[PDB]
Design a protein around this ligand. Structure first.
Ligand SMILES: [Zn+2]
Ligand SMILES: [Zn+2]
Ligand SMILES: [Zn+2]
Ligand SMILES: [Zn+2]
Ligand SMILES: [Zn+2]
Ligand SMILES: [Zn+2]
Length: 72
């Protein structure tokens, strides 16, 4: 599943919904090919690990939404 016809020029938006240990939240958007935008989203989560703890992801909306939670 998650069937995808790749095109170098494809343009999509990946939405990352972040939830932190204290319940605070934020959403960040990443644009580019599906693959590159997805990589950038996870890269952002990694930059936040030092201050917010390890993260866990639950993928939604056929891959266009990444619900990421930080353990603190
Ligand atoms: Zn699957
Ligand atoms: Zn094609
Ligand atoms: Zn198809
Ligand atoms: Zn693609
Ligand atoms: Zn490509
Ligand atoms: Zn710090």
């Amino acid at each position: 599943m998650h069937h995808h016809h790749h095109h170098a020029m494809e343009e999509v938006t990946i939405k990352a919904n972040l939830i932190f240990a204290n319940g605070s939240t934020q959403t960040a958007e990443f644009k580019g090919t599906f693959e590159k935008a997805t990589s950038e989203a996870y890269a952002y989560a990694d930059t936040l690990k030092k201050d917010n703890g390890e993260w866990t992801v639950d993928v939604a909306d056929k891959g266009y939404t990444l619900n990421i939670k930080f353990a603190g």
